[PDB]
Amino acid sequence: ISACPKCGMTFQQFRKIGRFGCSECYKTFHSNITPILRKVHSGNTVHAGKIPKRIGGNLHVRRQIDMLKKELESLIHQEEFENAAHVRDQIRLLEQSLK
């Protein structure tokens, strides 16, 4: 019941046409594509190969960011707030580095 905010495709449209409209369809139909990938790639659903050189930095960073956001959640839970202020500023530092 979503549609891609970049190319407007709906998931029923995707069922009919059989091709993704743009890069963002992948993010906005993530759940539903996994059965299709499973059928098409002999049960595989995650990429285990090349990463482009320029952007690889960016994605390494974003992975760190997500690990620290989860660690921040756990730190808030424990009422460990000085550590949380550190982790918040580190996330902010990495996000600035991206853009």
Place this chain on the structure above:
Amino acid sequence: KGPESDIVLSSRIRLARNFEHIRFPTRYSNEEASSIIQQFEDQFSEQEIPGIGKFVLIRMNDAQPLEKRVLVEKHLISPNLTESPFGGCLLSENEEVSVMLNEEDHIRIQCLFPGFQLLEAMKAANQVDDWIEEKVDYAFNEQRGYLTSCPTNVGTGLRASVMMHLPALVLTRQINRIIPAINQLGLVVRGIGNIFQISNQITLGKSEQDIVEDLNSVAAQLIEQERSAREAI
């Protein structure tokens, strides 16, 4: 020519890519299409990649129809592209490595080499890929990999193929049992007069190094079996 000029007619590597920030060819506008081909003309059309040579952009709109005929029959371009008013082919003067633009995907890097030379072809496709990627934000995603129009190509975006002439294997009737064996090893062989083409069944899950290694091992075993059967008759 080629290493096994007798057995394997060619080794092909095909890498499908897409621009991240441009809609795929299923949804994109004509402005977006002409802009892709314009960007390629501006930063790659008369540029060299050492070892591989000078690239030149052939736009479909400006091509002679018989010129389109020649590119099609050399497998540098698919027929759908000849009538596209926006497609393109960036060819090396060598002509072994070509880059098709604005077809099913924005970019398709092709390396067609004559002998049994999968890993060289792979190396050149990688060089070309790295070269384009320093000017093109590729449609990439950490869980899925390289993002493609069809779901059958997502991930490595890589199709690897080998063309083989196996007259002796067909004649010794071994071909029948070999074909299911090839298919269970995750390879698809389609027969196309004793010419067969083996290629990778999947594109996501394996790594490219391993896709090419798997195809390469299997082809090499078929080469040895064919030389044996020919020595027999």
